[PDB]
């Protein structure tokens, strides 16, 4: 278990009494820019979005999905001509977060006008506790 | 979006008489309707009624306040607003306890002044917006 209560985050590897049940299957390691995979990811993400100023903002937006607490009223959407860097880092983030901390939705959440009271819109109660959501590209 | 008040069940909900309907494959059970009705709407409705039973139990007001983070100079109508009111200040026990104390104190004030009758208090601003709304909205 990793506690992000303080800076830096403390990795608890001993006995505790914190009521923790959900998890991800990814082991935590400290921030190592010297790792070859770390350098590859940094270079690839820089190539996807060359603007350093935009790159920092995008990374800051992505780094907030780990927290499960209340978040500000922000919605973000970014598009492109086609065959861009989209759906590349999105899937990576989704699978890093994991099923317990992430899930996939459909555009039908927003393209619907008003679901009938009898209609069982189970899609509304998705993302319960999960701190990151996304919508796949449509046709 | 701009809705329309179809008046469906309107006189049915307004009356204090107990009434019920069919549940999700269950049995009906009449309950006394003892709930206060209030509406917060950005847009307008459409009223289609002329009987004295209707247009009598309706009260209207128009908000003269515009809340934006940058107040226009010498504009009490468009003044400063605090976004932190919406995003946070919910989890504070003290704020909600103070709100409850205010509500119970003013309920006691209403009971001791108007003998518990909200119809015994009238406002110059109220029933003036209602009069304009009933004079308007007619096709």
Automatic annotation (TrEMBL), chain A:
The family this protein is said to belong to: Belongs to the asfivirus helicase C962R family.
Binding site for ADP 9: 84-88
Protein's recorded name: Putative primase C962R
Residue numbers binding ADP 10: 84-87
Residues the entry annotates as binding ADP 4: 44, 83-84, 87
Chain sites annotated for binding Mg(2+) 3: 87
Residues reported in the UniProt entry to bind ADP 3: 44, 83-84, 87
Residues the record lists as binding Mg(2+) 1: 84, 86
Entry binding sites for ADP 7: 44, 85, 87
Binding site for ADP 6: 44, 84-85, 88
Binding site for ADP 5: 44, 83
Residue sites binding Mg(2+) 2 per the record: 86-87
Record: residues binding ADP 8: 83-87
Residues annotated as binding ADP 2: 44, 83-84, 86-87
